[PDB]
């Protein structure tokens, strides 16, 4: 109900109206697909659906990237095929998501207004296999018609690099050295994640407009994720990662922020000119907004 939710609602409503005006086909207008990206550390995508449904009469469906991780069996196969890549030894980065399922579900949602109008979305249970995670048997039932699809994720919209450009960033980091986390990894490990990320471009191209939460400084992500783990531990009897384990956890994600986050803001994206960025301080207060 706060400023970010209200401002994001205004943007969704305006983008929906443009989408509906622009639709130049004989079939029904598809849902507006809103991509959402923001760092580790309720929150926007937890509050925004009920706000739009209650106050603006919209029907929403939400896709969260983490619910589309590979099944545990498939992730084990991935780890075994890339034993020297620490980033692929468990869920998280590019390559650890089920891209056929993501594409199938987004295409299903995008045809859900056609005139039968139903979709099923996966749920991922991070506690299974002693915390390694697996797809749940439970699903989310979606009943059309749908005005808006929120498709959110810590790396949604992240763009791959040319080989030369990845090398450029890796070499630059080495000449400068808050150590850049890409220096924790081999060049071949980083190239693999980059190549994995190229497979997401068909998925990104299904997004119509975009909302991004950008910290003033990438260092906030560590601080926020520590707060989150302490908050969760304080409410669930004290079960969670240690501070050191949170650090190692976030060090697996930070190279992706360092290398690929700028791909959200570039001339070739499907949401170019239809993006809203919130710039936030460490207290998560909006300190600026930008369009992209």
Automatic annotation (TrEMBL):
It comes from the Eukaryota. GO terms for molecular function: kinase activity. InterPro entries: P-loop_NTPase. This is D-glycerate 3-kinase. It comes from Cryptococcus neoformans (strain H99 / ATCC 208821 / CBS 10515 / FGSC 9487) (Cryptococcus neoformans var. grubii serotype A). The lineage of its organism: Eukaryota, Fungi, Dikarya, Basidiomycota, Agaricomycotina.
């Amino acid at each position: 109900g706060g400023a970010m939710v209200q401002q994001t609602a205004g943007f969704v409503l305006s983008q929906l109206a443009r989408h509906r005006s622009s639709w130049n086909k004989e079939t029904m207008c598809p849902p507006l697909v809103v991509g959402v990206q923001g760092p580790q550390g309720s929150h926007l995508t937890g509050l925004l659906p009920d706000y739009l449904e209650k106050h603006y009469g919209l029907r929403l469906a939400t896709m969260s990237l983490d619910d589309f991780y590979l099944t545990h069996s498939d992730q084990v196969k991935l780890s075994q095929s890339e034993p020297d890549n620490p980033l692929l030894n468990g869920r998280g980065p590019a390559g650890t998501h089920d891209l056929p399922l993501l594409e199938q579900c987004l295409a299903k949602l995008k045809s859900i207004n056609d005139r039968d109008q139903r979709a099923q979305l996966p749920i991922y249970d991070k506690s299974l296999f002693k915390g390694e995670g697996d797809r749940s048997k439970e699903v989310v039932e979606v009943q059309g018609p749908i005005d808006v699809v929120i498709f959110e994720g810590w790396m949604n919209g992240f763009g791959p690099l040319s080989n030369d450009k990845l090398e450029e960033k890796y070499a630059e980091a080495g000449r400068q050295w808050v150590m850049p986390t890409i220096l924790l990894y081999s060049r071949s490990t980083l190239h693999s994640i980059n190549q994995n990320l190229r497979q997401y471009e068909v998925l990104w191209d299904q997004i119509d407009c975009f909302v991004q939460i950008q910290p003033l400084d990438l260092s906030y992500v560590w601080t926020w994720r520590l707060q989150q783990e302490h908050n969760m531990k304080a409410k669930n009897g004290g079960n969670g990662m240690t501070d050191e384990q949170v650090r190692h956890f976030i060090n697996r994600y930070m190279p992706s922020y360092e290398l690929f986050q700028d791909g959200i803001d570039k001339e070739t994206t499907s949401w170019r000119g239809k993006g809203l960025r919130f710039i936030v301080n460490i207290k998560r207060e909006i300190v600026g907004t930008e369009s992209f």
